[PDB]
Amino acid sequence: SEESQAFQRQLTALIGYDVTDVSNVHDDELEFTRRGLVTPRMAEVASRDPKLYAMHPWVTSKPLPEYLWKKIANNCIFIVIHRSTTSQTIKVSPDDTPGAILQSFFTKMDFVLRVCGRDEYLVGETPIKNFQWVRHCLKNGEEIHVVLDTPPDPALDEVRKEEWCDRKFRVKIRGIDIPVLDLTVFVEANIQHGQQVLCQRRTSPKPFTEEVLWNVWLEFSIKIKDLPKGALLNLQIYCQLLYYVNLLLIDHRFLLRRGEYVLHMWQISGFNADKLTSATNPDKENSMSISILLDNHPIAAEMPNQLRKQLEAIIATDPLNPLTAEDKELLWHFRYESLKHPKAYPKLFSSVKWGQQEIVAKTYQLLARREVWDQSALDVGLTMQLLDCNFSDENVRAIAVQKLESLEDDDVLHYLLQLVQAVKFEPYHDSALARFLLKRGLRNKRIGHFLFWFLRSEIAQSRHYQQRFAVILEAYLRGCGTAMLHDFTQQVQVIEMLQKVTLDIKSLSAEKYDVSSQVISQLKQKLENLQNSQLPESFRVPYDPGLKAGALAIEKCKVMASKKKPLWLEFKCADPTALSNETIGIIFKHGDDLRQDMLILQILRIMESIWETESLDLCLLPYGCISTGDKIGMIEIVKDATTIAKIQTGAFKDEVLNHWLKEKSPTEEKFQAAVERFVYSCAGYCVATFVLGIGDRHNDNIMITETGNLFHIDFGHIERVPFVLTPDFLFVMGTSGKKTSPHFQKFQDICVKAYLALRHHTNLLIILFSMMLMTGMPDIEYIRDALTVGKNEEDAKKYFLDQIEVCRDKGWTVQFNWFLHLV
Ligand SMILES: COc1c(OCCCN2CCOCC2)ccc2c1N=C(NC(=O)c1cnc(N)nc1)N1CCN=C21
């Protein structure tokens, strides 16, 4: 088809990468995958309920926390329906349906209830208490506003028609070269399974010249028949490590990899997921390469008491605790006793000799008897553990994915970023994991939307994985539907337009922080310019797809007075039934790796949900934030928010935050409401902060809302202090120096509960952390020590309370020091 090519060109624009391109490839794993993924797309496409697919209700099954019950303790809920001019209020039970609500409305005196100002719908057989919008309003003291109108046509979701032996192992190393570069140098070759080195050989070292030829067969200890699926041949270059590259020994059709390869290699920055990729370096003209030859096809009682004790001990340990040789032989010998314990599984499967066919066969036999796994309650931290870089067996990874099926869409969103990054640890482009993302994204539009940007964030920035992630995007976009394709297109254009301006603004003053409004005159011109004949009438807010944004409030846009020169932008909201005028605020910023900011924010969200599970609410404020490309993207602007900094030559007054709060609080009520929140918000930011290692912060980077909510910003690259709890904060808590106050006693009390609530999920956190570093940064011990592993709840409460007081001793000391250390 001719028009099927316009489609493929529309898909390339949206992706920012071309998936038909075979210039940087050496087999067909990508194309085979493009093709393999059709089945699962089509099936979930052919499977999803058109109506609910259009209206994408954002629903949960989790109970309501006691803290939103106390916000409505009379079995009643007020919803307000809107005609066009007129409205009418309604009184409702938290267990009503939107089905049932309407009825009482019509029967008071076909159509559907939609949130005011937002694309967001109250529909489906769910009790109104279980809608997130609703729960957002209750937490926010806000009243629900809704608008009775037509269902969105499910034709708007239409999907285009698609069309489509015992010989030891060896490798010859012919040589290396690079146009430009002198120590000595050798090639180390590694047979790798899940970070585990199975066998290793080196070359002789020879002098580093632009072309280096060895002509040497490298014989390893392993038999061909014993190489396992997912084995990487890992080629490295030392002198010590300068370059690396990887190749799959067994391919996506289970064929032993044969032949001549010339492989363009990656270089080291001056251990993380980039070191694992089977992608070759695209920059063919400047990169180091290496020439290789492969010519190696069929592939395919009781327990004593003290031992069980030792055994269970090992299972009790944390992820990061390494296993002895004895521990592994122990796990593997009573592997059937081990299988009974699903927490054991990671330890057990990293206690397998992946280097032996008979064992591996045994391990498959053992995964057949899986019934205890399959019946266990879904433990996500356990499940994630089996998808990190320590696992590279398809069958082990697949039982982890299986566990994920039972997640509802609401949980998926909590884990989506980190599940998207765990695609970096799969050995083959077509994983169970990828198909799970595909499927879930297609099943639900909210998932699909974030799925898009998560993939595009990396596709647009990582040469190590763009090709893989692109194949997967294409596969999503090819099932998401015309209305969302349209949308994604509006959104991409806008983003593209707005980076041009961000970058161009920057190079008009390198660091003369005084933003002369001569610099601000041009911003205005480029925006109006963009307006009249370029910039789409309206577009979805990427970090909050409920909102559709309209036209730039050009007067309210500025450039911020930073080291970089990020854009402060305010838009009009495109929805007419919006119940307010407040502009939608966005910061576009070149200069920070916002991928890392996404990751920290996302954990932050996980922690709330944790805390939710024990009826705590720390009023974290994890703002929207998306990496769009290389060191560039968007950040959500919180309304009525200011820097602790600005509330103050390194001089720091104590009272001024409380004064600031009282001068923004009209009633005395609202001021106490504000001090309450500040304690909660603060307590939460301090705990989370501590756990992750990002509490030593300058005042620039901590803000507070007019309404008392404190929040940290900008997770750039992170004497000392465990968190920021300065005198200004203490002042507000009505205490100073050595004495105490009820507000401080409360804050201490709240920190404690917050901390060990988190410690009830020590493994989950430890994983997400370790994954974050491997896939988000360019060591982990910190966190385990900060979570105080293996301690009774008292030891811990004591620890964290000592921490509180470290900041008390210090006080301004550190804050001061940033200034001092400027000069
Ligand atoms: C300090 O700049 C911010 C705000 O400042 C208000 C000051 C702007 N005025 C007000 C009206 O006229 C223009 C001048 C108000 C709100 C925010 C914010 N920064 C930020 N964040 C950052 O600046 C930031 C920068 N880099 C990175 N990586 N992350 C966040 N956020 C996050 C969401 N809320 C805000």
Alpha carbon distance 232, 392 (integer Å)? 10
Q: Is 816 one of the annotated binding-site residues?
A: no
Alpha carbon distance 422, 416 (integer Å)? 10
Q: Do 612 and 139 touch, CB atoms closer than 8 A?
A: no
Mutate to test the pocket of ligand 1, among 554, 563, 635, 647 (most ligand atoms within 8 A of CB): 635
Angle among Cα 484, 485, 487 to the nearest 5 degrees reads: 60
Q: Which two tokens stand for residue 358?
A: 């008979």
Strands (E), 62-158: 77-82, 87-92, 112-115, 121-122, 144-149
Mutate to test the pocket of ligand 1, among 713, 714, 717, 718 (most ligand atoms within 8 A of CB): 713
Q: Is 220 one of the annotated binding-site residues?
A: no
- Residue with CA at minimum distance from ligand 1 atom 6: 642
The distance of Cα 2 from the centroid of its chain, to the nearest Å, equals 38
Which atom of ligand 1 has the smallest separation from the CA of 713?
30
Q: For residue 90, give the DSSP letter.
A: E
Q: Ligand 1 mean position to 658 CA, how many Å? A: 21
Helix, strand or coil for residue 698?
A: coil
Nearest alpha-carbon partner for 732 in 683, 699, 689: 683
Q: Do 191 and 228 touch, CB atoms closer than 8 A?
A: no
Sign of CA dihedral 750, 752, 758, 760: negative
Cα-based distances in Å from 422 to 156, 199, 289, 601, 648: 33, 26, 28, 17, 43
What's the CA dihedral at 3, 9, 11, 15 to 10 degrees?
180
Sign of CA dihedral 595, 596, 597, 603: positive
DSSP string, 218-237: EEEEEEGGGPPTTPEEEEEE
User: Do β-strands 144-149 and 77-82 pair in parallel, antiparallel, or remain unpaired?
Assistant: parallel
Alpha carbon distance 75, 67 (integer Å)? 15
Q: Is 628 one of the annotated binding-site residues?
A: yes
Q: Which two tokens stand for residue 493?
A: 């254009």
Residues 6 or more apart whose CB falls under 8 angstroms from that of 623 comprise 543, 601, 635, 636, 638, 711, 713
Angle among Cα 376, 378, 381 to the nearest 5 degrees reads: 120
Nearest alpha-carbon partner for 491 in 90, 81, 54, 16: 16
Alpha carbon distance 275, 289 (integer Å)? 16
Which atom of ligand 1 has the smallest separation from the CA of 621?
33
DSSP string, 315-336: HHS-TTSPPPHHHHHHHHHTHH
Helix (H) or strand (E) segment spanning residue 421: helix 409-421
Mutate to test the pocket of ligand 1, among 544, 554, 637 (most ligand atoms within 8 A of CB): 637
Sign of CA dihedral 720, 721, 724, 726: negative
Q: Is 712 one of the annotated binding-site residues?
A: yes
Helix, strand or coil for residue 285?
A: coil
Q: Ligand 1 mean position to 703 CA, how many Å? A: 9
Cα-based distances in Å from 101 to 87, 97, 124, 142, 185: 15, 6, 12, 19, 75
What's the burial of 802, exposed, middle or buried (CB within 10 Å: 0-12/13-18/19+)?
Answer: exposed
Q: Is 731 one of the annotated binding-site residues?
A: no
Strands (E), 228-351: 232-238, 241-248, 259-264, 266-267, 289-294
Helix (H) or strand (E) segment spanning residue 547: strand 544-552
- Residue with CA at minimum distance from ligand 1 atom 21: 713
- Residue with CA at minimum distance from ligand 1 atom 5: 642
With a Cβ cut-off of 6 Å, ligand 1 is lined by: 558, 568, 587, 589, 592, 594, 597, 623, 635-638, 641-643, 703, 713-714
Which atom of ligand 1 has the smallest separation from the CA of 625?
29
Nearest alpha-carbon partner for 350 in 380, 329, 371: 329
Alpha carbon distance 416, 602 (integer Å)? 9
Alpha carbon distance 530, 553 (integer Å)? 13
Long-range contacts of 771-776 (CB under 8 A, 24+ apart): 771/384, 771/388, 771/418, 771/421, 771/422, 772/418, 772/599, 772/600, 772/603, 773/272, 774/271, 774/272, 774/273, 774/388, 774/389, 775/272, 775/273, 775/421, 775/424, 776/421, 776/595, 776/596, 776/599
Q: Do 248 and 262 touch, CB atoms closer than 8 A?
A: no
Strands (E), 553-701: 558-559, 567-573, 584-590, 625-629, 632-636, 641-643
Q: Is 590 one of the annotated binding-site residues?
A: yes
Q: Which two tokens stand for residue 570?
A: 């305010």
Cα-based distances in Å from 87 to 135, 438, 455, 577, 733: 22, 41, 42, 12, 43
Alpha carbon distance 497, 531 (integer Å)? 10
Q: Ligand 1 mean position to 575 CA, how many Å? A: 24
**Phi, psi dihedral angles at 573 (to 5 degrees):** -80, 125
The distance of Cα 73 from the centroid of its chain, to the nearest Å, equals 36
How many Cβ atoms from other residues are within 10 Å of residue 78's Cβ? 12
Alpha carbon distance 418, 420 (integer Å)? 5
Letter string b/e over residues 565-598, b meaning 16 or more CB atoms within 10 A of that residue's CB = bbbebbbbbbbeebeeeebbbbbbbbebbbbbbb
Q: For residue 484, give the DSSP letter.
A: H
Alpha carbon distance 513, 552 (integer Å)? 24
Q: For residue 737, give the DSSP letter.
A: T
Mutate to test the pocket of ligand 1, among 587, 590, 627, 642 (most ligand atoms within 8 A of CB): 587
Residues 6 or more apart whose CB falls under 8 angstroms from that of 363 comprise 349, 352, 393
Which atom of ligand 1 has the smallest separation from the CA of 568?
13
Nearest alpha-carbon partner for 624 in 611, 610, 634, 612: 634
Q: Ligand 1 mean position to 449 CA, how many Å? A: 25
Q: Ligand 1 mean position to 637 CA, how many Å? A: 6
Q: Which two tokens stand for residue 391?
A: 């696992």
Single-letter residue type at 808:
R
The distance of Cα 178 from the centroid of its chain, to the nearest Å, equals 37
Q: Ligand 1 mean position to 347 CA, how many Å? A: 45
| Domains along the sequence of the chain with CATH | 1-162 (3.10.20.90), 165-296 (2.60.40.150), 297-481 (1.25.40.70), 482-639 (3.30.1010.10), 640-816 (1.10.1070.11)
293 has which bridge partners? 172, 260
Nearest alpha-carbon partner for 626 in 681, 664, 674, 588: 588
Q: Ligand 1 mean position to 541 CA, how many Å? A: 17
Q: Which two tokens stand for residue 505?
A: 């603004």
Angle among Cα 434, 438, 444 to the nearest 5 degrees reads: 145
**Phi, psi dihedral angles at 818 (to 5 degrees):** -60, -50
Q: Do 569 and 588 touch, CB atoms closer than 8 A?
A: yes
Q: Which two tokens stand for residue 784?
A: 């385990």
Nearest alpha-carbon partner for 220 in 209, 231, 208, 205: 231
Alpha carbon distance 644, 703 (integer Å)? 5
Resolution to 1 decimal place, in Å? 2.7
Helices (H), 667-811: 668-692, 727-732, 742-759, 762-776, 781-786, 793-810
Residues 6 or more apart whose CB falls under 8 angstroms from that of 673 comprise 665, 707, 708
Helix, strand or coil for residue 1?
A: coil
Q: Do 151 and 269 touch, CB atoms closer than 8 A?
A: no
Nearest alpha-carbon partner for 611 in 688, 677, 714: 688
Q: Ligand 1 mean position to 814 CA, how many Å? A: 23
How many Cβ atoms from other residues are within 10 Å of residue 17's Cβ? 18
DSSP string, 161-215: PP-----EEEEEEEEEE-S----EEEEEEEEEETTEEEEEEEPPPEE--SEEEEE
Helix (H) or strand (E) segment spanning residue 544: strand 544-552
Q: Is 593 one of the annotated binding-site residues?
A: yes
Technique used: X-ray
Alpha carbon distance 572, 574 (integer Å)? 6
Helices (H) and strands (E) counted in the chain, each on its own, are 31, 25
Region label for 161, one of left (φ > 0), alpha (ψ between -120 and 50) or beta (otherwise):
beta
Largest Cα span, the chain: 91
The distance of Cα 238 from the centroid of its chain, to the nearest Å, equals 34
Q: Do 175 and 215 touch, CB atoms closer than 8 A?
A: yes
